[PDB]
Amino acid sequence: NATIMLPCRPAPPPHCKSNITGLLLLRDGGDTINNTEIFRPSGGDEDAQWCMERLGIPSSVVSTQLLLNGSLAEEEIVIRSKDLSDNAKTICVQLQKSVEIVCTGAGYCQISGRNWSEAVNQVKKKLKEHFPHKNISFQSSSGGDLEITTHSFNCGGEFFYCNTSGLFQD
Amino acid sequence: QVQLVQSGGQMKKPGESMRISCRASGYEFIDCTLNWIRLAPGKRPEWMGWLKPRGGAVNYARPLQGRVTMTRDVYSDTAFLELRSLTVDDTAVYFCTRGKNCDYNWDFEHWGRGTPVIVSSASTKGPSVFPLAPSSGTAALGCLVKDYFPEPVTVSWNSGALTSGVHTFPAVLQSSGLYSLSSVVTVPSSSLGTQTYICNVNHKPSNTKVDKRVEPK
Amino acid sequence: EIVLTQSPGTLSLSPGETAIISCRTSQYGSLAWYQQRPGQAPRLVIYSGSTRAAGIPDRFSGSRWGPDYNLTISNLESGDFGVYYCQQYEFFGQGTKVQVDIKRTVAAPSVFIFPPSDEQLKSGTASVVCLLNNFYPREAKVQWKVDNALQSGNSQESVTEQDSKDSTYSLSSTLTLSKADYEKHKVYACEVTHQGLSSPVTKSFNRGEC
Numbered sequence A: 001n002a003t004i005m006l007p008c009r010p011a012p013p014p015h016c017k018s019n020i021t022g023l024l025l026l027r028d029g030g031d032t033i034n035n036t037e038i039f040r041p042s043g044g045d046e047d048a049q050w051c052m053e054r055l056g057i058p059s060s061v062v063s064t065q066l067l068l069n070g071s072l073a074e075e076e077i078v079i080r081s082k083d084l085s086d087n088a089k090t091i092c093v094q095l096q097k098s099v100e101i102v103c104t105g106a107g108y109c110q111i112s113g114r115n116w117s118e119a120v121n122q123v124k125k126k127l128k129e130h131f132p133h134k135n136i137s138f139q140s141s142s143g144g145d146l147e148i149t150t151h152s153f154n155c156g157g158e159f160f161y162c163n164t165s166g167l168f169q170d
Numbered sequence B: 001q002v003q004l005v006q007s008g009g010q011m012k013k014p015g016e017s018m019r020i021s022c023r024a025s026g027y028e029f030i031d032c033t034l035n036w037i038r039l040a041p042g043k044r045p046e047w048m049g050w051l052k053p054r055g056g057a058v059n060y061a062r063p064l065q066g067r068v069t070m071t072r073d074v075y076s077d078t079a080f081l082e083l084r085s086l087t088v089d090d091t092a093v094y095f096c097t098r099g100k101n102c103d104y105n106w107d108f109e110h111w112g113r114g115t116p117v118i119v120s121s122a123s124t125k126g127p128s129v130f131p132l133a134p135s136s137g138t139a140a141l142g143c144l145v146k147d148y149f150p151e152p153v154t155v156s157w158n159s160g161a162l163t164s165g166v167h168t169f170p171a172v173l174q175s176s177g178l179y180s181l182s183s184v185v186t187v188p189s190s191s192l193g194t195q196t197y198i199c200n201v202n203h204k205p206s207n208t209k210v211d212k213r214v215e216p217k
Numbered sequence C: 001e002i003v004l005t006q007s008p009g010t011l012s013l014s015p016g017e018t019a020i021i022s023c024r025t026s027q028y029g030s031l032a033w034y035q036q037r038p039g040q041a042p043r044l045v046i047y048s049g050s051t052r053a054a055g056i057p058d059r060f061s062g063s064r065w066g067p068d069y070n071l072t073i074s075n076l077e078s079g080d081f082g083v084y085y086c087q088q089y090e091f092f093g094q095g096t097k098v099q100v101d102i103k104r105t106v107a108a109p110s111v112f113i114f115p116p117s118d119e120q121l122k123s124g125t126a127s128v129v130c131l132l133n134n135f136y137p138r139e140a141k142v143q144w145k146v147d148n149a150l151q152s153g154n155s156q157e158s159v160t161e162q163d164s165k166d167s168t169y170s171l172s173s174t175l176t177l178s179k180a181d182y183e184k185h186k187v188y189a190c191e192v193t194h195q196g197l198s199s200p201v202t203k204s205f206n207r208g209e210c
């Protein structure tokens, strides 16, 4: 449980720090192997902005996987989605405590593994409420373009990509 | 309109990988989720995964993770399915399907023509036609189209003139991976003495055409 | 995870009468019924539980009560017969097979037996063929006997569809042996057991006769 280094590709400058408010996930469909529900980071897909609007993320913030500069849900994690049992509709997780992502300007952006893993466990606990009696699991995206596969944000008018392999592998 | 044109049927062998396509014409390609479903012989439809072309986000069914890979091509409105490390249990018909509304993906009104994939360790063979002799009311005789692969074959009698009392049974998959087929006909016994009968077999998948004369023993 | 339980799997009906298929879903969701004509791509019949799909006869009507869903077909046309699957989200059901069965007077089969051609024997194998021909109803039993030795496993039945002309079924069981095994034994018999026959008819041939 130490600090995590995320190799963001286009060398994000050292002044790109943002406060993670929520996540965008997708539940794997089909018969559940070994009684485990898998969740992977999404870009939002059909109802992407819908989620961002409900989390108070401004129109200037366009990100994937990790939602930034939103408003945290008071009291507990809030799980939203046009439909949970529909694996085609993306899932919209709003955190109660943020996790700052700080970019060092050296080809990496850092996220404290202690605070991040604390959020991950809170999210898994809440997801275990809606999907009861099944081990909740996170994993990295199973396919798509590099905007969907990585945490893609923009800083200073430049679009960047951040390999979130370290964040979603439980 | 809602038109989903798929590629032709392929024959693969255990271990090989397959790639099939599906071009979508008649609607905004990227606005609708596009799924791949396969129907196997006697097994309920199995959903393999879907793909949202705006962003290319794939969602593969948990069983198939690792083997399956779903891509797209927005320039040409073509969705691709790749399944790797095939087995005899992958013999099935694969479909790309789209929902009725692009707001709900699981009401598949629009289905592709279908692309069948046969996974057997048995290269193509042309049939051997053997005569089912009558051997002496009415008497019956026929042909046996045996040890051929893949389906299908066409059996006609007397170049299409004789069609009353004809039975072309369904083919059977033999333990050796090849198919067998019986086509018989019932005729007056006296006619059997004077009248002559031929069965014409055409196995197009191997360009094997045969005309067997069925003669009493 | 949805547990769709569909019944009854097999349905034999004559054109016209009603056909009621049904599913039972664990979770609550919008359910659709699909039609697969044999040799064609599936067809969307019902969606959203009972909302009839596009261009589907008013004869197709779905009903829902709690977790149980029905599909009711009335006045079975010729093209309706096939296999019907119920879908909820990404999961389907076992399905049911809707077969056409024209009711008529119980006929009987015309059992004929064909030894293996001498050409086939020269090639190394041997395939004997029994032929239950033009009977009704479908259910018939072919037992292969060889020197009064019941044969199970070697045979391989294969049945044709309802003959549109006379509404009768035909069948051809193909028993296969190696030339060695064939040339070992003698009397090859095919025992038929259809209700149309008062007792089992045992058409047979002794090897080397005519």
Ligand SMILES: *[C@@H]1O[C@H](CO)[C@@H](O[C@@H]2O[C@H](CO)[C@@H](O[C@@H]3O[C@H](CO)[C@@H](O)[C@H](O)[C@@H]3O)[C@H](O)[C@H]2NC(C)=O)[C@H](O)[C@H]1NC(C)=O
Residues within 6 Å of the ligand: C020, C022, C063, C064, C065, C068, C069, C070
């Ligand atoms: C789906 O199809 C089935 C088959 O028809 C329906 O189940 C039927 O339910 C009705 C309920 O009204 C039963 O009829 C009743 O049976 C008893 C007889 O003592 C009586 O309480 C009523 O006067 C009436 O006769 C019926 O037994 C039952 N089906 C069969 C074959 O018996 C069902 O309603 C259909 N729709 C659904 C389930 O949504």
Ligand SMILES: *[C@@H]1O[C@H](CO)[C@@H](O)[C@H](O)[C@H]1NC(C)=O
Residues within 6 Å of the ligand: A015, A016, A017, A018, A019, A068, A069, A154, A155
């Ligand atoms: C919003 O995000 C930008 C980077 O995208 C960051 O510089 C800024 O501090 C964030 N605002 C807040 C209130 O955290």
Ligand SMILES: *[C@@H]1O[C@H](CO)[C@@H](O)[C@H](O)[C@H]1NC(C)=O
Residues within 6 Å of the ligand: A017, A018, A019, A098, A100, A101, A102
């Ligand atoms: C946002 O994060 C920055 C640094 O990452 C921090 O200085 C600031 O206090 C945070 N504000 C909120 C509201 O989280």
Ligand SMILES: *[C@@H]1O[C@H](CO)[C@@H](O)[C@H](O)[C@H]1NC(C)=O
Residues within 6 Å of the ligand: A149, A150, A163, A164, A165
């Ligand atoms: C992310 O990084 C890990 C290791 O650093 C690598 O194995 C993985 O392939 C990367 N993913 C992408 C989408 O580049």
Ligand SMILES: [Cl-]
Residues within 6 Å of the ligand: A019, A021, A069, A070, A071, A072, A098
């Ligand atoms: Cl904040």
Ligand SMILES: [Cl-]
Residues within 6 Å of the ligand: A143, A144, A145
């Ligand atoms: Cl990819």
Ligand SMILES: [Cl-]
Residues within 6 Å of the ligand: A007, A008, A009, A162, A163
């Ligand atoms: Cl990377």
Ligand SMILES: [Cl-]
Residues within 6 Å of the ligand: B042, B043, B044, C094
């Ligand atoms: Cl099954």
Ligand SMILES: [Cl-]
Residues within 6 Å of the ligand: B091, B092, B093, B116, B117, B118
């Ligand atoms: Cl097939």
Ligand SMILES: [Cl-]
Residues within 6 Å of the ligand: B127, B128, B129, B130, B210
């Ligand atoms: Cl030949």
Ligand SMILES: [Cl-]
Residues within 6 Å of the ligand: B169, B170, B171, B172, B180, B181, B182, C157, C158, C172, C174
């Ligand atoms: Cl056969």
Ligand SMILES: [Cl-]
Residues within 6 Å of the ligand: B166, B167, B168, C160, C161, C162, C163
């Ligand atoms: Cl017929």
Ligand code: NA
Residues within 6 Å of the ligand: C146, C177, C181
């Ligand atoms: Na034997």
